[PDB]
Protein backbone atom coordinates (compact mmCIF):
# COMPACT_ATOMS: atom_id res chain seq x y z
CA UNK A 1 0.00 0.00 0.00
CA UNK A 2 2.89 2.33 0.81
CA UNK A 3 4.36 1.18 -2.51
CA UNK A 4 1.09 1.81 -4.38
CA UNK A 5 1.41 5.55 -3.75
CA UNK A 6 5.02 5.48 -4.97
CA UNK A 7 3.97 3.83 -8.24
CA UNK A 8 1.39 6.59 -8.78
CA UNK A 9 3.81 9.40 -7.92
CA UNK A 10 6.64 7.96 -10.00
CA UNK A 11 4.34 7.40 -12.98
CA UNK A 12 3.16 11.01 -12.76
CA UNK A 13 6.70 12.36 -12.45
CA UNK A 14 7.93 10.25 -15.39
CA UNK A 15 5.23 11.71 -17.67
CA UNK A 16 5.51 15.33 -16.46
CA UNK A 17 6.49 18.01 -19.02
CA UNK A 18 9.27 19.17 -16.66
CA UNK A 19 10.74 15.66 -16.16
CA UNK A 20 13.05 15.81 -19.17
CA UNK A 21 16.31 16.49 -17.19
CA UNK A 22 15.64 13.61 -14.80
CA UNK A 23 14.52 10.67 -16.94
CA UNK A 24 18.01 9.13 -17.33
CA UNK A 25 21.27 9.27 -15.33
CA UNK A 26 23.46 12.28 -16.06
CA UNK A 27 26.38 11.21 -18.26
CA UNK A 28 29.50 12.66 -16.56
CA UNK A 29 31.42 12.37 -19.83
CA UNK A 30 29.08 15.05 -21.22
CA UNK A 31 28.82 17.31 -18.14
CA UNK A 32 32.09 18.82 -16.96
CA UNK A 33 32.50 18.73 -13.18
CA UNK A 34 29.42 16.62 -12.45
CA UNK A 35 31.34 13.67 -11.04
CA UNK A 36 33.37 16.06 -8.85
CA UNK A 37 30.37 17.92 -7.40
CA UNK A 38 27.56 15.34 -7.14
CA UNK A 39 28.49 12.52 -4.76
CA UNK A 40 25.24 10.51 -5.03
CA UNK A 41 23.58 10.78 -8.46
CA UNK A 42 19.94 9.84 -8.77
CA UNK A 43 17.32 9.95 -11.51
CA UNK A 44 13.83 8.68 -12.29
CA UNK A 45 14.90 5.61 -14.26
CA UNK A 46 17.14 4.50 -11.39
CA UNK A 47 14.11 4.86 -9.11
CA UNK A 48 11.91 2.98 -11.60
CA UNK A 49 14.45 0.15 -11.78
CA UNK A 50 14.73 -0.05 -7.99
CA UNK A 51 10.94 -0.03 -7.67
CA UNK A 52 10.64 -2.79 -10.29
CA UNK A 53 12.94 -5.25 -8.52
CA UNK A 54 11.28 -4.56 -5.16
CA UNK A 55 14.31 -2.68 -3.80
CA UNK A 56 12.33 -0.16 -1.72
CA UNK A 57 11.41 -1.37 1.75
CA UNK A 58 9.31 1.69 2.65
CA UNK A 59 7.93 4.86 1.11
CA UNK A 60 10.42 6.93 3.13
CA UNK A 61 13.24 5.33 1.14
CA UNK A 62 11.45 6.19 -2.10
CA UNK A 63 11.02 9.82 -1.04
CA UNK A 64 14.69 10.05 -0.03
CA UNK A 65 15.69 9.18 -3.61
CA UNK A 66 13.18 11.65 -5.05
CA UNK A 67 14.48 14.46 -2.85
CA UNK A 68 18.05 13.52 -3.79
CA UNK A 69 17.20 14.09 -7.47
CA UNK A 70 16.16 17.65 -6.65
CA UNK A 71 18.95 18.33 -4.14
CA UNK A 72 21.50 17.31 -6.80
CA UNK A 73 19.68 19.51 -9.32
CA UNK A 74 19.89 22.57 -7.07
CA UNK A 75 23.50 21.80 -6.13
CA UNK A 76 24.71 21.68 -9.71
CA UNK A 77 22.38 23.96 -11.71
CA UNK A 78 21.62 27.65 -11.36
CA UNK A 79 18.05 28.36 -10.27
CA UNK A 80 17.51 30.29 -13.53
CA UNK A 81 19.03 27.65 -15.82
CA UNK A 82 16.71 25.54 -17.97
CA UNK A 83 17.45 22.43 -15.90
CA UNK A 84 17.20 24.37 -12.64
CA UNK A 85 13.81 25.78 -13.62
CA UNK A 86 12.54 22.31 -14.55
CA UNK A 87 13.85 20.91 -11.27
CA UNK A 88 11.93 23.50 -9.25
CA UNK A 89 8.71 22.55 -11.04
CA UNK A 90 9.39 18.85 -10.45
CA UNK A 91 10.41 19.38 -6.82
CA UNK A 92 7.25 21.35 -6.04
CA UNK A 93 5.16 18.75 -7.87
CA UNK A 94 6.69 15.92 -5.83
CA UNK A 95 6.28 17.73 -2.51
CA UNK A 96 2.64 18.56 -3.21
CA UNK A 97 1.73 15.04 -4.38
CA UNK A 98 3.60 13.43 -1.49
CA UNK A 99 1.69 15.64 0.95
CA UNK A 100 -1.76 14.77 -0.39
CA UNK A 101 -0.96 11.09 0.15
CA UNK A 102 0.49 11.46 3.67
C1 LIG B 1 22.36 20.08 -18.31
C2 LIG B 1 22.60 18.57 -18.11
C3 LIG B 1 21.55 17.85 -17.16
C4 LIG B 1 20.44 17.13 -17.60
C5 LIG B 1 19.95 16.90 -18.90
C6 LIG B 1 19.24 15.73 -19.20
S7 LIG B 1 18.78 15.88 -20.88
C8 LIG B 1 19.53 17.44 -21.06
N9 LIG B 1 19.55 18.25 -22.32
C10 LIG B 1 18.83 17.88 -23.58
C11 LIG B 1 18.74 18.91 -24.73
N12 LIG B 1 19.36 20.19 -24.54
C13 LIG B 1 19.61 20.59 -23.21
C14 LIG B 1 20.35 19.52 -22.38
C15 LIG B 1 21.74 19.11 -22.98
O16 LIG B 1 21.85 18.06 -23.51
N17 LIG B 1 22.91 19.96 -22.86
C18 LIG B 1 24.15 19.45 -23.47
C19 LIG B 1 25.12 18.76 -22.45
C20 LIG B 1 25.32 19.68 -21.24
C21 LIG B 1 24.54 17.41 -21.99
C22 LIG B 1 26.46 18.50 -23.16
N23 LIG B 1 20.08 17.79 -19.91
N24 LIG B 1 19.78 16.66 -16.53
C25 LIG B 1 20.39 16.99 -15.39
C26 LIG B 1 19.89 16.59 -14.02
C27 LIG B 1 21.51 17.75 -15.71
C28 LIG B 1 22.48 18.32 -14.65
C29 LIG B 1 23.90 18.79 -15.04
O30 LIG B 1 22.15 18.37 -13.51
MG1 LIG C 1 15.07 18.23 2.23
CATH number, position 26: 1.20.920.10
Q: Domain count of the chain?
A: 1
Which of 24, 25, 31 best tests ligand 1's pocket when mutated (most atoms within 8 Å of CB)? 31
Taking alpha carbons only, the member of 88, 93, 61 closest to residue 74 is 88
Residue 48's domain spans which residues? 1-100
Q: How was this one solved?
A: X-ray
Ligand index nearest the alpha carbon of residue 69: 1
DSSP E strands, the chain: none
Cα–Cα distances (Å) from 85 to 19, 41, 78, 88, in that order, read 11, 19, 8, 5
Neighbour tally for 70: CB within 10 Å: 19
Amino acid sequence: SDLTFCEIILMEMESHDAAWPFLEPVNPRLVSGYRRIIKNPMDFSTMRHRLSRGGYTSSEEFAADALLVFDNCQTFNEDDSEVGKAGHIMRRFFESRWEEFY
